[PDB]
């Protein structure tokens, strides 16, 4: 039976997610279409999230991903939501069952967590700094503290954003795992930490540079980056030069799709194939 | 680029159209999903036609087919309608362009016409009787009189339905091509005609039998049938026994999809492949 999926969000032209799902469905013998549903684009602009979700239900979609700015807004519209997505307050994956009812999940969390396992298997996790509370920073922080990080300091230009994220995560896990810290002087905090993750767009071609002064890194740090365009960000280059273990941004981006594909289809995805597709774009 | 299509109508479980489009898209190197959008089914029940059409636009469909009960209702909702579909007052094919605008066509007409060319190439067309004005009977009648039939007599249980169809067709072609005739005593009219087409559901397993007494046929008649479940209807069996040339119902059903696929995709469909898919279900 053919598989029909889509992604509801804004500014979706460069998403690698549609190609990953289309190729893997086909590799498993199932014709698969995965449509961008971009509310800045030529088809869905100006439509409400509920309209688009309902449309997917009526027209036989088997699942959706959800991205900015709808990952929090979508929760109340869904029939069921996983406890993890419920506690984070964000859903990136919606499974649509035969009768058009919906279950929300968050594979950004599971995907980053898998990335940590795959790419940082020996990393010291006692104390970690995350720079950036926006984008997928919420899922990243949640994954960090549920995959071994004892103390996470989250810095954002907007201190209130970092504190809000800290409160959400701490409530979800039931301990004071996360503390908001000032972005100014974050270098000193990183220097004392075991690892640091960039969750800002810094490093992308339209946001060149690094979110902090990389001279504060030492060889003993590990460094992670959410940015995967480019794969080798200035931050990760600087970390690698020192001999730091690194976690690049492709791992989360691939694994969120691996986990979503499994949820959408009940098939076991081939990670290496989905990684190949991801890198080919 | 992957292709996304659907069919809006009621009672669509046994449609062979989705499989034909999915297989041909894939045969041409394009992952293709074709969804039933059945307003008696588990996803789209109770939704208005406009809601479903708009949904297709927003979620990136490249085209739709339309069937009962929406082929006339859909016209005013479309941005452009072919002159042929306009004159018949019925659309079965909607091409959705990049900006989400719509062009209506009728490939039931073109499909039956192609069936006549392919299956009745030597047939005498001066005088033809069509039994049934419902279902695709409107498209069939239009095709008949635009592909060489000089006089078409359309009989229906509901005489007003046959007369309404006659008026539509005559207006479309600009001559008195069609006349409504009584269903009672239709045997005498058929006996005097060159050919007869069944456009009722008679012959299907839930409507067994024939729409008229086949003893009125002679070897010189040709006989056509809209029914393709079964392919060899009691009517067509009786015609074949006499040595009549016959036109079975698979030709229209396949060619409407051939022509729609070309319209949806700009690709030249392989008729033999689509016929193979059709017969395999």
Swiss-Prot record, chains A, B:
The active site is at residue 71. CDD domains: NAD_bind_Shikimate_DH. Optimum pH is 9-10. It catalyses: L-quinate + NAD(+) = 3-dehydroquinate + NADH + H(+); shikimate + NAD(+) = 3-dehydroshikimate + NADH + H(+). GO terms for biological process: amino acid biosynthetic process; aromatic amino acid family biosynthetic process; chorismate biosynthetic process; shikimate metabolic process. NAD(+) binds at residues 135-136, 156, 161, 201-204, 211, 226, 249. Keywords: Amino-acid biosynthesis, Aromatic amino acid biosynthesis, NAD, Oxidoreductase. Pathway: Metabolic intermediate biosynthesis; chorismate biosynthesis; chorismate from D-erythrose 4-phosphate and phosphoenolpyruvate: step 4/7; Aromatic compound metabolism; 3,4-dihydroxybenzoate biosynthesis; 3-dehydroquinate from D-quinate (NAD(+) route). Involved in the biosynthesis of the chorismate, which leads to the biosynthesis of aromatic amino acids, and plays a key role in the quinate degradation pathway. Catalyzes the NAD(+)-dependent oxidation of both quinate and shikimate to 3-dehydroquinate and 3-dehydroshikimate, respectively. It can only use NAD. Has a different substrate and cosubstrate specificities relative to all other known bacterial shikimate/quinate dehydrogenases. Belongs to the shikimate dehydrogenase family. This is Quinate/shikimate dehydrogenase (NAD(+)). It comes from Corynebacterium glutamicum (strain ATCC 13032 / DSM 20300 / JCM 1318 / BCRC 11384 / CCUG 27702 / LMG 3730 / NBRC 12168 / NCIMB 10025 / NRRL B-2784 / 534).
């Amino acid at each position: 039976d053919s598989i029909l999926l889509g992604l509801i969000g804004q500014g979706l032209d460069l998403s690698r997610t549609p190609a990953m799902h289309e190729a893997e469905g086909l590799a498993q013998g199932r014709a698969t279409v995965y449509r961008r549903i971009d509310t800045l684009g030529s088809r869905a602009s100006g439509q409400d999230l509920k309209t688009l979700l309902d449309a997917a239900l009526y027209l036989g979609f088997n699942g959706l991903n959800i991205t900015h700015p709808y990952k929090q807004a979508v929760l109340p519209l869904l029939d069921e939501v996983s406890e993890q997505a419920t506690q984070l307050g964000a859903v990136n994956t919606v499974v649509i069952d035969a009768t058009g009812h919906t279950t929300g999940h968050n594979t950004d969390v599971s995907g980053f967590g898998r990335g940590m396992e795959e790419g940082l298997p020996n990393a010291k996790l006692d104390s970690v700094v995350q720079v950036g509370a926006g984008g997928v920073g919420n899922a990243v922080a949640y994954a960090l503290v549920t995959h071994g990080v004892q103390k996470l300091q989250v810095a954002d230009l907007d201190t209130s954003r970092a504190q809000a994220l800290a409160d959400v995560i701490n409530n979800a896990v039931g301990r004071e795992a996360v503390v908001g810290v000032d972005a100014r002087g974050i270098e000193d905090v990183i220097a004392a930490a075991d690892g640091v993750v960039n969750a800002t767009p810094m490093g992308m071609p339209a946001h060149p540079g690094t979110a902090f002064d990389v001279s504060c890194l030492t060889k003993d740090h590990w460094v992670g980056d959410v940015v995967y365009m480019p794969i080798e960000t200035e931050l990760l280059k600087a970390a690698r030069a020192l001999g730091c273990e690194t976690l690049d941004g492709t791992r989360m981006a691939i694994h969120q799709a691996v986990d979503a594909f499994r949820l959408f289809t009940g098939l076991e995805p081939d990670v290496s194939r989905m990684r190949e597709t991801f890198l080919s774009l």
